[PDB]
Design an enzyme around this catalytic site. Structure first.
Site, PDB file in Angstrom:
ATOM      1  N   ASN A   1     -31.496   4.723  68.694  1.00 40.98           N
ATOM      2  CA  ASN A   1     -30.942   5.783  69.529  1.00 40.98           C
ATOM      3  C   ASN A   1     -29.506   6.115  69.146  1.00 40.98           C
ATOM      4  O   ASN A   1     -29.073   7.261  69.313  1.00 40.98           O
ATOM      5  CB  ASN A   1     -31.031   5.391  71.004  1.00 40.98           C
ATOM      6  CG  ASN A   1     -32.464   5.301  71.496  1.00 40.98           C
ATOM      7  OD1 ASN A   1     -33.397   5.691  70.794  1.00 40.98           O
ATOM      8  ND2 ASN A   1     -32.644   4.780  72.703  1.00 40.98           N
TER       9      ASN A   1
ATOM     10  N   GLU B   1     -28.116  31.191  65.979  1.00 39.44           N
ATOM     11  CA  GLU B   1     -28.094  31.938  64.729  1.00 39.44           C
ATOM     12  C   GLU B   1     -28.872  31.203  63.643  1.00 39.44           C
ATOM     13  O   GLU B   1     -29.554  31.832  62.826  1.00 39.44           O
ATOM     14  CB  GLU B   1     -26.645  32.171  64.305  1.00 39.44           C
ATOM     15  CG  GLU B   1     -26.428  33.351  63.388  1.00 39.44           C
ATOM     16  CD  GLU B   1     -24.957  33.655  63.194  1.00 39.44           C
ATOM     17  OE1 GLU B   1     -24.217  33.672  64.200  1.00 39.44           O
ATOM     18  OE2 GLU B   1     -24.536  33.860  62.036  1.00 39.44           O
TER      19      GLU B   1
ATOM     20  N   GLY C   1     -45.676   8.395  74.824  1.00 38.01           N
ATOM     21  CA  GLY C   1     -45.721   7.932  76.196  1.00 38.01           C
ATOM     22  C   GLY C   1     -46.533   8.855  77.082  1.00 38.01           C
ATOM     23  O   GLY C   1     -46.664  10.050  76.826  1.00 38.01           O
ATOM     24  N   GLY C   2     -47.085   8.280  78.152  1.00 33.06           N
ATOM     25  CA  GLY C   2     -47.861   9.081  79.085  1.00 33.06           C
ATOM     26  C   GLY C   2     -47.006  10.076  79.844  1.00 33.06           C
ATOM     27  O   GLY C   2     -47.444  11.193  80.133  1.00 33.06           O
ATOM     28  N   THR C   3     -45.779   9.684  80.185  1.00 34.74           N
ATOM     29  CA  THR C   3     -44.854  10.603  80.837  1.00 34.74           C
ATOM     30  C   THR C   3     -44.232  11.560  79.827  1.00 34.74           C
ATOM     31  O   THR C   3     -44.207  12.776  80.047  1.00 34.74           O
ATOM     32  CB  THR C   3     -43.767   9.822  81.578  1.00 34.74           C
ATOM     33  OG1 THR C   3     -44.370   8.981  82.569  1.00 34.74           O
ATOM     34  CG2 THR C   3     -42.790  10.773  82.254  1.00 34.74           C
TER      35      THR C   3
ATOM     36  N   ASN D   1     -39.884   7.986  64.440  1.00 33.52           N
ATOM     37  CA  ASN D   1     -39.319   6.659  64.653  1.00 33.52           C
ATOM     38  C   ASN D   1     -39.389   5.802  63.396  1.00 33.52           C
ATOM     39  O   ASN D   1     -38.518   4.954  63.179  1.00 33.52           O
ATOM     40  CB  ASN D   1     -40.034   5.963  65.810  1.00 33.52           C
ATOM     41  CG  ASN D   1     -39.273   6.074  67.115  1.00 33.52           C
ATOM     42  OD1 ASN D   1     -38.135   6.542  67.145  1.00 33.52           O
ATOM     43  ND2 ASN D   1     -39.898   5.639  68.203  1.00 33.52           N
TER      44      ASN D   1
ATOM     45  N   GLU E   1     -51.368   6.616  71.471  1.00 39.03           N
ATOM     46  CA  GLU E   1     -50.279   7.548  71.188  1.00 39.03           C
ATOM     47  C   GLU E   1     -50.707   8.751  70.348  1.00 39.03           C
ATOM     48  O   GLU E   1     -50.186   9.852  70.603  1.00 39.03           O
ATOM     49  CB  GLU E   1     -49.110   6.797  70.537  1.00 39.03           C
ATOM     50  CG  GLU E   1     -48.376   5.881  71.515  1.00 39.03           C
ATOM     51  CD  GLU E   1     -47.015   5.433  71.015  1.00 39.03           C
ATOM     52  OE1 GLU E   1     -46.224   6.294  70.580  1.00 39.03           O
ATOM     53  OE2 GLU E   1     -46.732   4.218  71.068  1.00 39.03           O
TER      54      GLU E   1
ATOM     55  N   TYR F   1     -34.615  -0.197  69.909  1.00 39.96           N
ATOM     56  CA  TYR F   1     -34.403   1.145  70.442  1.00 39.96           C
ATOM     57  C   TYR F   1     -32.925   1.510  70.428  1.00 39.96           C
ATOM     58  O   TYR F   1     -32.561   2.654  70.135  1.00 39.96           O
ATOM     59  CB  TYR F   1     -34.949   1.250  71.866  1.00 39.96           C
ATOM     60  CG  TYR F   1     -36.457   1.258  71.978  1.00 39.96           C
ATOM     61  CD1 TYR F   1     -37.243   1.927  71.049  1.00 39.96           C
ATOM     62  CD2 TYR F   1     -37.092   0.607  73.028  1.00 39.96           C
ATOM     63  CE1 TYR F   1     -38.624   1.937  71.158  1.00 39.96           C
ATOM     64  CE2 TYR F   1     -38.466   0.613  73.146  1.00 39.96           C
ATOM     65  CZ  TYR F   1     -39.228   1.277  72.209  1.00 39.96           C
ATOM     66  OH  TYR F   1     -40.598   1.280  72.329  1.00 39.96           O
TER      67      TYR F   1
END
Ligand SMILES: Nc1nc2c(ncn2[C@@H]2O[C@H](COP(=O)(O)OP(=O)(O)OP(=O)(O)O)[C@@H](O)[C@H]2O)c(=O)[nH]1
Ligand SMILES: Nc1nc2c(ncn2[C@@H]2O[C@H](COP(=O)(O)OP(=O)(O)OP(=O)(O)O)[C@@H](O)[C@H]2O)c(=O)[nH]1
Ligand SMILES: COc1cc(C(=O)c2c[nH]c(-c3cccc4[nH]ccc34)n2)cc(OC)c1OC
Ligand SMILES: [Ca+2]
Ligand SMILES: [Mg+2]
EC number: 3.6.5.-
Lengths: 421, 440, 66
Positions: free
Chosen positions: B228, B254, B143-145, B206, B183, B224
């Protein structure tokens, strides 16, 4: 809110524009009075995109209707849904361009363009977050072609960071005998190559052939042609109007469909003109293309496909991967995953399953070559050039438009011949 | 103390954040309104779950989290969703226009308008911390963001919080649920820009998650939401050591000592077991040996690669549930005789084991069966560089033609940033090759 | 040995500060060059569009020679 400002210019532009608003208003459950009469709340989730909500739960198309010809205003008003448009958004002259690009672009159209820009300004400045603009017009006439491209230039001056999208109807002798349309189209393509971000090539040659050969309609009318146009426009805007896993907008479409700025002329396709395998094969069939080009005469840079209706997404995914493997040679190897599929549960009226295709294919040069051939046949004889020099145009502007379009063809050919290795 | 602040950037980061925080609440007995009846210290506390939850005087347990997206669609669902009362409105930050799948817009054009506000809201959370230990950053590569804004944020976090640790959960792109053709571009740009600013990054492919959902949960076409739910289980297994405590619980820091031999080699491979349908799990109980053996089956990995054709630099096993060391040691002994586990010559071969006793939780209506014991393997293997190789090749195919590059140049980027990013990736692939060569 | 202890922690401070400083500076240079690149790209676009306004008035002045 990601608003789109819609503009329709000239006879063809206003005709396909009105049908577009009729079709999608029905899909969103909007009646001619602007009142919502809907089943699903998927109809209103992204309604900002094309409609403004006035107090009283009334939705008004964010549409500007423009022509140098006064008649079209009344025909829009008297047509179904004429009663939904804002009356202040009707901007019309008294002249009429008489299929003269120079009149639309430089003289009579320039006199009227500021009046249109004022309407664009109220609509754009009310927008929460403006996506950009979508224009409907033909390239063969004088107003939609000449003034339409002048409007695009003027809007881009004030909104240089917004997307400019057009639905451009290409001329064909099979539907129009007007002689100068190859001039008007070449002069328009000259503008479109530089000043739009994405252009749907809606080819009257392809529209005629589909009605005649496939639907067996001799003497096809504009209602028959525009029936295909409205199906196409509904399909290629489905991902803008409905909530989807892809959440499309005009910029994301351009980023993914346009690898090089000038190569932004798309081949639309529609099916049916059914099983999922049938849809996918038909959608990629040359007979279902809205641009008179054979995809197997070139290669796809990018492809966007939207399937509409209740169907198995697994089956769609399998079939899309299948047509890519069996037609590997017609997709460029140097753009991975350049074919994207989307699904919308809501089918269009009268069909339970449909598929709409947006292709950026190097075979689109077949369309520009056809216009270039008709253009040069007249320009080599200088026929009717006084119509254009008479409005102050210089004759090598014709030289430049032809040369720019010939460059576009060669550039499409360059990436058709490119290889990964 | 040692609080952790979670930052969820972009759609993928936000939606995975939804799944993780819902799962966290069920694991700790926190209701959707933030009330935790089992918590007897009202308005504060030093418990293990306080690393991820602060407390108000009214008894609300608030995630130490910020959600950021450049458009409001996805976070608006958090604002109106089941757990809307969990978050203070200032923890949910939205703009009006997204990055349109463009790293340059997320990093420069659009991201620069909101970065100061985001840092201000992060500082509000950090000021509530008595011993801030670091950040957990969730985002997509594609994604661009998720690419552009995250790397901008990570750069600013290095400035504002010195070398305070920053961990990533990064969504590696897959064609099956891809959203953009560019992408690979966004992935290479953000990996290059973030590399110096991240101490440890857990990549989630993914495609790997997609295949596990299809193969193991018998999900015909994973969404999704399907992806998720599985991802949040793996994230919870990784953060469980920070949110629970017990005598056999090894802290994540650790494990990180063992997993990062060189600063750039900070990409552990996660493998999780068991992923089993409720219909398969019924009457079939999977032992410690069985779930541990499943950690060495490539089909269960978070990113597609073959560690059988690479070398190990570290191997960590993070168990939760009914698990005792005796059964772990026997399982490891069996696996070592029968599996392809080759370590580099400069690392010890022992396996670091952590056990958290609370069994795994499942969210109602999911596809995962409730199981008595689960394990997440974190291994440092040279095979993870296969993910870079595949991504870098897709980059090369398009960049050789400069395809789509004009969308980035138009936002102010230069071609030199593309080639500089790609050269860094080439050096990273070389680094993974060099670490695998025997000593001289 | 006490002097060496001082120098170790001072080196640790100096390297953390230098990392912050250079990350701060590289970012400021990146944002500034990107700002001027995008501004120049927009300025070139308007300049070409403004040259279309100059050619358009020129076409009208030529017709005014009717
Ligand atoms: N598909 C389709 N094409 C149309 C339609 N109306 C006109 N055209 C085409 O448009 C071209 C001419 O452009 P017009 O829109 O009629 O002309 P205009 O834009 O109104 O400009 P002027 O009339 O010269 O002022 C011809 O080639 C027609 O074939 C329509 O309703 N549907
Ligand atoms: N696993 C998983 N991946 C997701 C999810 N949402 C998006 N992705 C992946 O993330 C990539 C797209 O990036 P996004 O996060 O959606 O985009 P963004 O960060 O919002 O940036 P913008 O371009 O501004 O929208 C694609 O590869 C998607 O497959 C999700 O909910 N879960
Ligand atoms: C799939 O169909 C549509 C998409 C989009 C769109 O914004 C988008 C985003 N990525 C893409 C895209 C395009 C081509 C190859 C790709 N490989 C990965 C993503 C991608 N296309 C817009 C549409 O209509 C307006 C539309 O309907 C037809
Ligand atoms: Ca407490
Ligand atoms: Mg987004």
């Amino acid at each position: 809110m990601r608003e789109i400002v819609h503009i329709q210019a000239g006879q063809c532009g206003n005709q396909i524009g009105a049908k577009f608003w009729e079709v999608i208003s029905d899909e969103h459950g909007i009646d001619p009075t602007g009142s919502y009469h809907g089943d699903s709340d998927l109809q209103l989730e992204r309604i900002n995109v094309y409609y403004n909500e006035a107090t009283g739960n009334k939705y008004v198309p964010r549409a500007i209707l423009v022509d140098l010809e006064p008649g079209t205003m009344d025909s829009v008003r008297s047509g179904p849904f004429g009663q939904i448009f804002r009356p202040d958004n009707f901007v019309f002259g008294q002249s009429g361009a008489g299929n003269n690009w120079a009149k639309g672009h430089y003289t009579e159209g320039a006199e009227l363009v500021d009046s249109v820009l004022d309407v664009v300004r109220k609509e754009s400045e009310s927008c929460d977050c403006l996506q950009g603009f979508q224009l409907t017009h033909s390239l063969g006439g004088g107003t939609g072609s000449g003034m339409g491209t002048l409007l695009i230039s003027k809007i881009r001056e004030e909104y240089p960071d917004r997307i400019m999208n057009t639905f451009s109807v290409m001329p064909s002798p099979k539907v129009s005998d007007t002689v100068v349309e190859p001039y008007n189209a070449t002069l328009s393509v000259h503008q479109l190559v530089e000043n739009t971000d994405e252009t749907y090539c809606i080819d009257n040659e392809a529209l005629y052939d589909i009605c005649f050969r496939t639907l067996k309609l001799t003497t096809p009318t504009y209602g028959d042609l525009n029936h295909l146009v409205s199906a196409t426009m509904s399909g290629v805007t489905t991902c803008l109007r409905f909530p989807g896993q892809l959440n499309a907008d005009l910029r994301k479409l351009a980023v993914n469909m346009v690898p090089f700025p000038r190569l932004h002329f798309f081949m639309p396709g529609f099916a049916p003109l059914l099983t999922v395998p049938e849809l996918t094969q038909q959608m990629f069939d040359s007979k279902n293309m809205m641009a008179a080009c054979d995809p197997r005469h070139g290669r796809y840079l990018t492809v966007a496909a939207i399937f509409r209706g209740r169907m198995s997404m697994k089956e769609v995914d399998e079939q899309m991967l299948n047509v890519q493997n069996k037609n590997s040679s017609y997709f460029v190897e140097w753009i991975p995953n350049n074919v994207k599929t989307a699904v919308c549960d809501i089918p269009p009226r009268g069909l339970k399953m449909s598929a709409t295709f947006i292709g950026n294919s190097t075979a689109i040069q077949e369309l520009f070559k056809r216009i270039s051939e008709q253009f040069t046949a007249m320009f080599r004889r200088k026929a009717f050039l006084h119509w254009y020099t008479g409005e102050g145009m210089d004759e090598m502007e014709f030289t430049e438009a032809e040369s720019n379009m010939n460059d576009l063809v060669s550039e499409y050919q360059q990436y058709q011949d490119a290889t990964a290795d | 103390m040692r609080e952790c602040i979670s930052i969820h950037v972009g759609q993928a980061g936000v939606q995975i954040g939804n799944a993780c925080w819902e799962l966290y609440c069920l694991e700790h007995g926190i209701q959707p309104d933030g009330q935790m009846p089992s918590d007897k210290t009202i308005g504060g506390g030093d418990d293990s779950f306080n690393t991820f939850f602060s407390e108000t005087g009214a008894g609300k347990h608030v995630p130490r989290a910020v959600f950021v997206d450049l458009e409001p669609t996805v976070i608006d669902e958090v604002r109106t969703g089941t757990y809307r009362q969990l978050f203070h409105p200032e923890q949910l930050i939205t703009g009006k226009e997204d990055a349109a799948n463009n790293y340059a817009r997320g990093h420069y054009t659009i991201g620069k308008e909101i970065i100061d506000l985001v840092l201000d809201r992060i500082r509000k959370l950090a000021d509530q911390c008595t011993g801030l230990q670091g950040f957990l950053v969730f985002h997509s590569f594609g994604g661009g963001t998720g690419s552009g804004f995250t790397s901008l944020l990570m750069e600013r976090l290095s400035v504002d919080y010195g070398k305070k640790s920053k961990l990533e959960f990064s969504i590696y792109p897959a064609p099956q649920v891809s959203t953009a053709v560019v992408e690979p571009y966004n992935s290479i740009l953000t990996t290059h820009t973030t590399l110096e600013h991240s101490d440890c990054a857990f990549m989630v492919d993914n495609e790997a998650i997609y295949d596990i959902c299809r193969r193991n949960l018998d999900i015909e076409r994973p969404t999704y939401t399907n992806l998720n739910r599985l991802i949040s289980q793996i994230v919870s297994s990784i953060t469980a050591s920070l949110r629970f405590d017990g005598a056999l619980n090894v802290d994540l820091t650790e494990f990180q000592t063992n997993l990062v031999p060189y600063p750039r080699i900070h990409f552990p491979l996660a493998t999780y077991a068991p992923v089993i349908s409720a219909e398969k799990a019924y009457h079939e109980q999977l032992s410690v040996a069985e779930i541990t053996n499943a950690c060495f089956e490539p089909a269960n990995q978070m990113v597609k690669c073959d560690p059988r054709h690479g070398k190990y630099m570290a191997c960590c096993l993070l168990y939760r549930g009914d698990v005792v060391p005796k059964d772990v040691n026997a399982a490891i002994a069996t696996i070592k005789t029968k599996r392809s586990i080759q370590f580099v010559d400069w690392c010890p071969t022992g396996f670091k084991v952590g056990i958290n006793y609370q069994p795994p939780t499942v969210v109602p209506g999911g596809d995962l069966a409730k199981v008595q014991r689960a394990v997440c393997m974190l291994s440092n293997t040279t095979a993870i560089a296969e993910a870079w190789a595949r991504l870098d090749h897709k980059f090369d195919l398009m960049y050789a033609k400069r395809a789509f590059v004009h969308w980035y140049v138009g936002e102010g980027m230069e071609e030199g940033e593309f080639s500089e990013a790609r050269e860094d990736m080439a050096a990273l692939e070389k680094d993974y090759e060099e670490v695998g060569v025997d000593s001289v | 040995k006490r002097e060496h202890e001082r120098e170790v922690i001072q080196k640790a401070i100096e390297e953390n500060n230098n990392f912050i400083k250079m990350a701060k500076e590289k970012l400021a240079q990146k944002m500034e060059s990107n700002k001027e690149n995008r501004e120049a790209h927009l300025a070139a676009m308007l300049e070409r569009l403004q040259e279309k306004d100059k050619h358009a008035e020129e076409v009208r002045k030529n017709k005014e020679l009717k």
